[PDB]
């Protein structure tokens, strides 16, 4: 109750009214369930809306527009009160794009958070308990655990709640409690109650802390506190403390963000400086102060246009899309920017079991020795059907279903399988399919015994529930176990001491482990029902079939099973160190060996092939035999079926017996590792990083945390420990290897979408800057006023720019070598692409304005000289006759310049679906969000042109069809010019959608029906 570690185990059982064996009764469970509450903590939402919005407005670029909106508001404080929605339009069209980007970023970020949270509940924490529903060990959800329930634990199996250890079945318990209180030291558990009711957590040597992890051993006990009463809900705080650790790309964008603002501020100053002369013009009012304020309004309005204020919104949108796509693929991304650096992965080191294989181990081949003939002998190679845990199948000698009792070896072999077994088979009635409780290898033996049915028990009339534990139950009733020995790494075996139930003592100490260790530690054969000494001939024959089973095209993991005919008594047994265990299993009697298949997932074979296609090296690191590991590598495609592996396959011992000069060169070439220990996994990361490589190490255990932290990218496991998850940048809920390759592909797509966004705004907004500077050089009248410049920013830098975050993945996204973070964000060739497009956009806007002045049917025919010197327009001027000075302030040239600038940048947005794929390969409807944004932006432009009260505000006027065709005649070639730029990059630097082509051909022909050209160019 209050002081759990003060009362005796019998006392706590009596207080709860529960027995260890039978467990809590159904009435007891339902009483306690509604009395205390479910074993869960009150989970709060991640971020509130207000703090989510403030996060949108914290970058430099967005904050700059907040200042410029404030400047434009205070600058418009000369005609106030009387004017309401006329002068204050300039601040409004700056805040409009700010909230348009913020809402999209907030909407996407909320959607990404929701996708993760639904994935958390998709796989529930599952706990093993004993109840009155069924006698055998059963699994229940962790949230359904109520105090007082008897709960068993094993290796791994994250502790559900505070439990009072009733008995320690294993020899020793290793528990890591650093996740909760920070003490990494392993603590020896015991049943002695702590005298101090307020004992320090360090003194708590008998409590399994809630939410912690168990390194090794199995224990039994009763849960005392569930949910809020656990110290994981009281002692710890909210733990709202995360470190961004800015991605090398994020540091680049911040550096590019500040570098751009320095360049933009220099340009906007230059606009003011190069416009000193036009300060005393009569249009400004004849006062120099008013002249210096108007051109300052252009200076800030150009800054609002030129600065890419959508950069924070498109990065958040791109990352949130990447996270949501991963959550749909059952992959939790803890830190949002980390999904970007996955695209940069160059080496993927992954464990074999669980990640590269389904971990659905099932016995398919097994053999026992038939007879011995001189040096050689004979075998009984059996084939057994059934690739799942369901205990249905028949054994085949060659093709015939064989009786169990026909062979004395089979019945003896099943006893070793069943008695040395530590797992069991559980029938999940909720899903209707059998499930494993414990190690997969051990559970495979359990269903093997049920299939054989050595005792020939009548299985026809038995229920489905008892099908799982029918043969194991009867075989254990006749023949019981006393105690077991812990499986140690050096021994590579696990043994058990047993004594028959009936008073015969015919005690046999069964063994089980790796074929190499067991065979070398046995000196006899149980040929049927007789003992035969081990010779040199049977040395090779047993090894020959095992290597054939393992190294063969079926990839069998074998386990030699033997018996200790004359074991030592428990008086001389020592349970202190692994040294005792290795010398306690000698002169064993080999009876036979089994074989389990671990089938690689169907999609793993293709994913490994795709990684080699994208330039990603895949390394498989496993504790399996080297011969088996190489065969499994060849099976999935890491190694070719006829490839030399004399320098790519390294074992743990082989790696260690090398000088560091060869070790470094080994990691450059090595593609698989076998029989390693957690010290090597961190060593491999260090050697790969020394090569300037981005590694994605896969780990699930507590000892893998140093490897995951040192790795550039750490990927945990859904069924793994909690310590690895908190030290990883990604968690695979589905425990699938192919999702790693999908994450790399998505990370590459996220980077490309930012490059398209940067390309679109830099190449378009530099054209806006060129327009103002080219006009000043040519002496032409002003092309755009501040409210027209701010409208172009709202239309062309807002939703159309952000929609590039939803771009479809590129065609050859996975056909190129991984990106190097060392190279700069923008290459030299991309600067040429930005300038070339921007140069045309700027020249198009000036040319469109001069088109109306010079060669327009509906306007005057002012020559180039009279336009380049329009400030000399005088009635008495000898070279100015037939043109009035009022025509140089008409809104047609500004509407011609505005509409071209908007439209030519909408067409440029169509060029930004891919860096090098033409519009023919990718039609614009691949990105339906972009097409919708383009249509909305053009709809907005038409709204302010042909709605009566609006054009006065923006100082523009409606355009007829003849002028609109000229807008399209100049805007369209930005597509053609960029297609040439893409074509040069496609071919000279290193499929056509016919329905799209036949759709735009009528458009191009109709637009290019007539043509108008200029004349008398003197200075240009
Ligand atoms: Ca802008
Ligand atoms: Ca723009």
PDB file of C-alpha atoms in Angstrom, residues 451-634:
ATOM      1  CA  UNK A 451       3.007 -30.706 -34.085  1.00  0.00           C
ATOM      2  CA  UNK A 452       4.858 -33.944 -33.313  1.00  0.00           C
ATOM      3  CA  UNK A 453       2.553 -34.990 -30.440  1.00  0.00           C
ATOM      4  CA  UNK A 454       5.054 -37.568 -29.233  1.00  0.00           C
ATOM      5  CA  UNK A 455       2.790 -38.966 -26.504  1.00  0.00           C
ATOM      6  CA  UNK A 456      -0.008 -39.481 -29.082  1.00  0.00           C
ATOM      7  CA  UNK A 457      -2.533 -37.621 -26.944  1.00  0.00           C
ATOM      8  CA  UNK A 458      -6.017 -37.372 -28.443  1.00  0.00           C
ATOM      9  CA  UNK A 459      -6.006 -33.870 -29.942  1.00  0.00           C
ATOM     10  CA  UNK A 460      -9.265 -34.283 -31.883  1.00  0.00           C
ATOM     11  CA  UNK A 461     -11.647 -33.569 -28.998  1.00  0.00           C
ATOM     12  CA  UNK A 462      -9.595 -30.819 -27.345  1.00  0.00           C
ATOM     13  CA  UNK A 463     -10.522 -27.144 -27.482  1.00  0.00           C
ATOM     14  CA  UNK A 464      -8.646 -24.475 -29.423  1.00  0.00           C
ATOM     15  CA  UNK A 465      -7.303 -22.858 -26.242  1.00  0.00           C
ATOM     16  CA  UNK A 466      -5.614 -26.060 -25.050  1.00  0.00           C
ATOM     17  CA  UNK A 467      -4.222 -26.758 -28.534  1.00  0.00           C
ATOM     18  CA  UNK A 468      -1.346 -24.373 -27.791  1.00  0.00           C
ATOM     19  CA  UNK A 469      -0.278 -26.114 -24.560  1.00  0.00           C
ATOM     20  CA  UNK A 470      -1.452 -29.714 -24.948  1.00  0.00           C
ATOM     21  CA  UNK A 471       1.733 -31.673 -25.675  1.00  0.00           C
ATOM     22  CA  UNK A 472       3.899 -29.389 -23.532  1.00  0.00           C
ATOM     23  CA  UNK A 473       1.611 -29.824 -20.517  1.00  0.00           C
ATOM     24  CA  UNK A 474       1.555 -33.632 -20.573  1.00  0.00           C
ATOM     25  CA  UNK A 475       5.281 -33.886 -21.318  1.00  0.00           C
ATOM     26  CA  UNK A 476       5.979 -31.644 -18.314  1.00  0.00           C
ATOM     27  CA  UNK A 477       3.665 -33.542 -15.952  1.00  0.00           C
ATOM     28  CA  UNK A 478       5.617 -36.772 -16.456  1.00  0.00           C
ATOM     29  CA  UNK A 479       9.047 -35.117 -16.475  1.00  0.00           C
ATOM     30  CA  UNK A 480       9.673 -32.003 -14.363  1.00  0.00           C
ATOM     31  CA  UNK A 481      12.546 -29.506 -14.159  1.00  0.00           C
ATOM     32  CA  UNK A 482      14.414 -28.425 -11.029  1.00  0.00           C
ATOM     33  CA  UNK A 483      16.362 -25.350 -12.163  1.00  0.00           C
ATOM     34  CA  UNK A 484      17.840 -23.762 -15.279  1.00  0.00           C
ATOM     35  CA  UNK A 485      21.153 -22.175 -16.249  1.00  0.00           C
ATOM     36  CA  UNK A 486      21.342 -18.701 -17.771  1.00  0.00           C
ATOM     37  CA  UNK A 487      22.397 -18.580 -21.419  1.00  0.00           C
ATOM     38  CA  UNK A 488      25.818 -16.915 -21.481  1.00  0.00           C
ATOM     39  CA  UNK A 489      27.567 -15.375 -24.474  1.00  0.00           C
ATOM     40  CA  UNK A 490      30.794 -17.360 -24.082  1.00  0.00           C
ATOM     41  CA  UNK A 491      29.000 -20.703 -23.709  1.00  0.00           C
ATOM     42  CA  UNK A 492      26.442 -20.041 -26.483  1.00  0.00           C
ATOM     43  CA  UNK A 493      24.107 -22.534 -24.821  1.00  0.00           C
ATOM     44  CA  UNK A 494      21.296 -22.780 -22.283  1.00  0.00           C
ATOM     45  CA  UNK A 495      20.878 -25.819 -20.043  1.00  0.00           C
ATOM     46  CA  UNK A 496      18.428 -27.102 -17.448  1.00  0.00           C
ATOM     47  CA  UNK A 497      18.587 -29.622 -14.607  1.00  0.00           C
ATOM     48  CA  UNK A 498      15.627 -31.983 -14.360  1.00  0.00           C
ATOM     49  CA  UNK A 499      14.485 -35.003 -12.339  1.00  0.00           C
ATOM     50  CA  UNK A 500      11.610 -37.380 -13.186  1.00  0.00           C
ATOM     51  CA  UNK A 501       8.367 -36.964 -11.264  1.00  0.00           C
ATOM     52  CA  UNK A 502       7.984 -40.658 -10.468  1.00  0.00           C
ATOM     53  CA  UNK A 503      10.493 -42.085  -7.958  1.00  0.00           C
ATOM     54  CA  UNK A 504      12.737 -43.900 -10.436  1.00  0.00           C
ATOM     55  CA  UNK A 505      17.381 -40.895  -9.587  1.00  0.00           C
ATOM     56  CA  UNK A 506      17.342 -40.952 -13.405  1.00  0.00           C
ATOM     57  CA  UNK A 507      18.133 -37.245 -13.620  1.00  0.00           C
ATOM     58  CA  UNK A 508      19.080 -35.917 -17.061  1.00  0.00           C
ATOM     59  CA  UNK A 509      20.480 -32.410 -17.578  1.00  0.00           C
ATOM     60  CA  UNK A 510      19.177 -31.266 -20.957  1.00  0.00           C
ATOM     61  CA  UNK A 511      21.168 -28.753 -23.006  1.00  0.00           C
ATOM     62  CA  UNK A 512      20.460 -26.448 -25.942  1.00  0.00           C
ATOM     63  CA  UNK A 513      22.590 -23.958 -27.846  1.00  0.00           C
ATOM     64  CA  UNK A 514      24.700 -23.207 -30.878  1.00  0.00           C
ATOM     65  CA  UNK A 515      25.733 -26.317 -32.859  1.00  0.00           C
ATOM     66  CA  UNK A 516      29.461 -25.555 -32.650  1.00  0.00           C
ATOM     67  CA  UNK A 517      29.653 -25.288 -28.865  1.00  0.00           C
ATOM     68  CA  UNK A 518      27.298 -28.170 -28.076  1.00  0.00           C
ATOM     69  CA  UNK A 519      28.948 -30.607 -30.494  1.00  0.00           C
ATOM     70  CA  UNK A 520      32.465 -29.927 -29.194  1.00  0.00           C
ATOM     71  CA  UNK A 521      31.203 -30.411 -25.616  1.00  0.00           C
ATOM     72  CA  UNK A 522      29.588 -33.810 -26.306  1.00  0.00           C
ATOM     73  CA  UNK A 523      31.347 -37.174 -26.566  1.00  0.00           C
ATOM     74  CA  UNK A 524      28.478 -39.607 -27.242  1.00  0.00           C
ATOM     75  CA  UNK A 525      25.458 -40.153 -29.489  1.00  0.00           C
ATOM     76  CA  UNK A 526      22.009 -41.355 -28.444  1.00  0.00           C
ATOM     77  CA  UNK A 527      21.463 -43.606 -31.463  1.00  0.00           C
ATOM     78  CA  UNK A 528      17.788 -44.389 -30.947  1.00  0.00           C
ATOM     79  CA  UNK A 529      17.747 -45.843 -27.430  1.00  0.00           C
ATOM     80  CA  UNK A 530      21.476 -46.662 -27.195  1.00  0.00           C
ATOM     81  CA  UNK A 531      24.561 -44.615 -26.331  1.00  0.00           C
ATOM     82  CA  UNK A 532      27.311 -44.502 -28.968  1.00  0.00           C
ATOM     83  CA  UNK A 533      30.680 -42.744 -28.499  1.00  0.00           C
ATOM     84  CA  UNK A 534      31.512 -39.712 -30.615  1.00  0.00           C
ATOM     85  CA  UNK A 535      34.250 -40.258 -33.205  1.00  0.00           C
ATOM     86  CA  UNK A 536      36.042 -38.132 -35.791  1.00  0.00           C
ATOM     87  CA  UNK A 537      33.741 -39.244 -38.609  1.00  0.00           C
ATOM     88  CA  UNK A 538      30.577 -38.023 -36.900  1.00  0.00           C
ATOM     89  CA  UNK A 539      32.422 -34.764 -36.216  1.00  0.00           C
ATOM     90  CA  UNK A 540      32.339 -33.858 -39.901  1.00  0.00           C
ATOM     91  CA  UNK A 541      28.989 -35.391 -40.869  1.00  0.00           C
ATOM     92  CA  UNK A 542      27.071 -33.432 -38.230  1.00  0.00           C
ATOM     93  CA  UNK A 543      28.954 -30.265 -39.182  1.00  0.00           C
ATOM     94  CA  UNK A 544      28.412 -30.981 -42.884  1.00  0.00           C
ATOM     95  CA  UNK A 545      24.612 -31.067 -42.665  1.00  0.00           C
ATOM     96  CA  UNK A 546      24.501 -27.971 -40.438  1.00  0.00           C
ATOM     97  CA  UNK A 547      26.620 -25.897 -42.825  1.00  0.00           C
ATOM     98  CA  UNK A 548      24.519 -27.192 -45.721  1.00  0.00           C
ATOM     99  CA  UNK A 549      21.388 -26.172 -43.810  1.00  0.00           C
ATOM    100  CA  UNK A 550      22.852 -22.790 -42.874  1.00  0.00           C
ATOM    101  CA  UNK A 551      25.012 -21.746 -45.821  1.00  0.00           C
ATOM    102  CA  UNK A 552      22.502 -23.259 -48.253  1.00  0.00           C
ATOM    103  CA  UNK A 553      19.830 -21.417 -50.212  1.00  0.00           C
ATOM    104  CA  UNK A 554      17.351 -21.892 -47.328  1.00  0.00           C
ATOM    105  CA  UNK A 555      19.216 -20.005 -44.543  1.00  0.00           C
ATOM    106  CA  UNK A 556      18.506 -22.295 -41.591  1.00  0.00           C
ATOM    107  CA  UNK A 557      19.547 -21.342 -38.051  1.00  0.00           C
ATOM    108  CA  UNK A 558      20.319 -24.634 -36.313  1.00  0.00           C
ATOM    109  CA  UNK A 559      20.492 -25.551 -32.623  1.00  0.00           C
ATOM    110  CA  UNK A 560      22.243 -28.719 -31.478  1.00  0.00           C
ATOM    111  CA  UNK A 561      20.311 -30.465 -28.700  1.00  0.00           C
ATOM    112  CA  UNK A 562      21.986 -33.023 -26.438  1.00  0.00           C
ATOM    113  CA  UNK A 563      21.642 -34.657 -23.022  1.00  0.00           C
ATOM    114  CA  UNK A 564      23.908 -34.990 -19.981  1.00  0.00           C
ATOM    115  CA  UNK A 565      23.605 -38.678 -19.117  1.00  0.00           C
ATOM    116  CA  UNK A 566      25.588 -38.399 -15.851  1.00  0.00           C
ATOM    117  CA  UNK A 567      25.128 -34.881 -14.455  1.00  0.00           C
ATOM    118  CA  UNK A 568      26.486 -33.554 -11.189  1.00  0.00           C
ATOM    119  CA  UNK A 569      24.173 -33.031  -8.228  1.00  0.00           C
ATOM    120  CA  UNK A 570      22.863 -29.663  -7.059  1.00  0.00           C
ATOM    121  CA  UNK A 571      25.250 -29.726  -4.082  1.00  0.00           C
ATOM    122  CA  UNK A 572      28.227 -28.893  -6.320  1.00  0.00           C
ATOM    123  CA  UNK A 573      26.251 -26.524  -8.568  1.00  0.00           C
ATOM    124  CA  UNK A 574      27.379 -22.893  -8.456  1.00  0.00           C
ATOM    125  CA  UNK A 575      25.207 -20.015  -9.691  1.00  0.00           C
ATOM    126  CA  UNK A 576      27.714 -17.170  -9.287  1.00  0.00           C
ATOM    127  CA  UNK A 577      29.551 -16.545 -12.576  1.00  0.00           C
ATOM    128  CA  UNK A 578      29.535 -17.721 -16.190  1.00  0.00           C
ATOM    129  CA  UNK A 579      32.804 -19.591 -15.578  1.00  0.00           C
ATOM    130  CA  UNK A 580      30.920 -22.248 -13.607  1.00  0.00           C
ATOM    131  CA  UNK A 581      28.277 -22.666 -16.310  1.00  0.00           C
ATOM    132  CA  UNK A 582      30.708 -23.504 -19.116  1.00  0.00           C
ATOM    133  CA  UNK A 583      32.384 -26.361 -17.201  1.00  0.00           C
ATOM    134  CA  UNK A 584      29.087 -27.840 -15.949  1.00  0.00           C
ATOM    135  CA  UNK A 585      28.087 -29.085 -19.435  1.00  0.00           C
ATOM    136  CA  UNK A 586      30.648 -31.718 -20.430  1.00  0.00           C
ATOM    137  CA  UNK A 587      30.544 -35.232 -21.896  1.00  0.00           C
ATOM    138  CA  UNK A 588      27.074 -34.597 -23.298  1.00  0.00           C
ATOM    139  CA  UNK A 589      25.145 -37.069 -25.460  1.00  0.00           C
ATOM    140  CA  UNK A 590      24.122 -35.607 -28.814  1.00  0.00           C
ATOM    141  CA  UNK A 591      20.649 -36.732 -29.861  1.00  0.00           C
ATOM    142  CA  UNK A 592      19.779 -34.465 -32.805  1.00  0.00           C
ATOM    143  CA  UNK A 593      19.611 -30.945 -34.152  1.00  0.00           C
ATOM    144  CA  UNK A 594      16.719 -28.787 -35.324  1.00  0.00           C
ATOM    145  CA  UNK A 595      16.446 -25.911 -37.768  1.00  0.00           C
ATOM    146  CA  UNK A 596      14.385 -22.717 -37.728  1.00  0.00           C
ATOM    147  CA  UNK A 597      13.723 -20.447 -40.699  1.00  0.00           C
ATOM    148  CA  UNK A 598      13.695 -16.664 -40.330  1.00  0.00           C
ATOM    149  CA  UNK A 599      12.044 -15.455 -43.541  1.00  0.00           C
ATOM    150  CA  UNK A 600      13.070 -12.014 -44.791  1.00  0.00           C
ATOM    151  CA  UNK A 601      10.141  -9.734 -45.497  1.00  0.00           C
ATOM    152  CA  UNK A 602       8.812  -9.704 -49.052  1.00  0.00           C
ATOM    153  CA  UNK A 603       9.745  -6.047 -49.600  1.00  0.00           C
ATOM    154  CA  UNK A 604      13.204  -6.271 -47.993  1.00  0.00           C
ATOM    155  CA  UNK A 605      14.675  -7.817 -51.149  1.00  0.00           C
ATOM    156  CA  UNK A 606      13.608  -4.847 -53.279  1.00  0.00           C
ATOM    157  CA  UNK A 607      14.622  -2.219 -50.712  1.00  0.00           C
ATOM    158  CA  UNK A 608      18.196  -3.523 -50.535  1.00  0.00           C
ATOM    159  CA  UNK A 609      18.334  -3.428 -54.338  1.00  0.00           C
ATOM    160  CA  UNK A 610      17.011   0.141 -54.387  1.00  0.00           C
ATOM    161  CA  UNK A 611      19.583   1.359 -51.849  1.00  0.00           C
ATOM    162  CA  UNK A 612      22.409   0.050 -54.034  1.00  0.00           C
ATOM    163  CA  UNK A 613      20.724   1.898 -56.906  1.00  0.00           C
ATOM    164  CA  UNK A 614      20.683   5.163 -54.921  1.00  0.00           C
ATOM    165  CA  UNK A 615      24.298   4.822 -53.777  1.00  0.00           C
ATOM    166  CA  UNK A 616      23.517   3.790 -50.187  1.00  0.00           C
ATOM    167  CA  UNK A 617      25.659   1.099 -48.583  1.00  0.00           C
ATOM    168  CA  UNK A 618      23.673  -1.384 -46.477  1.00  0.00           C
ATOM    169  CA  UNK A 619      25.478  -3.188 -43.650  1.00  0.00           C
ATOM    170  CA  UNK A 620      23.854  -6.060 -41.759  1.00  0.00           C
ATOM    171  CA  UNK A 621      25.098  -6.496 -38.185  1.00  0.00           C
ATOM    172  CA  UNK A 622      23.900  -9.609 -36.375  1.00  0.00           C
ATOM    173  CA  UNK A 623      24.849 -12.130 -33.723  1.00  0.00           C
ATOM    174  CA  UNK A 624      24.141 -15.012 -36.103  1.00  0.00           C
ATOM    175  CA  UNK A 625      26.758 -17.391 -37.479  1.00  0.00           C
ATOM    176  CA  UNK A 626      29.029 -15.946 -40.156  1.00  0.00           C
ATOM    177  CA  UNK A 627      28.180 -18.686 -42.646  1.00  0.00           C
ATOM    178  CA  UNK A 628      24.466 -18.101 -42.104  1.00  0.00           C
ATOM    179  CA  UNK A 629      24.869 -14.314 -42.233  1.00  0.00           C
ATOM    180  CA  UNK A 630      26.640 -14.406 -45.605  1.00  0.00           C
ATOM    181  CA  UNK A 631      23.927 -16.669 -47.029  1.00  0.00           C
ATOM    182  CA  UNK A 632      21.205 -14.349 -45.722  1.00  0.00           C
ATOM    183  CA  UNK A 633      23.092 -11.421 -47.254  1.00  0.00           C
ATOM    184  CA  UNK A 634      23.142 -13.222 -50.604  1.00  0.00           C
TER     185      UNK A 634
END
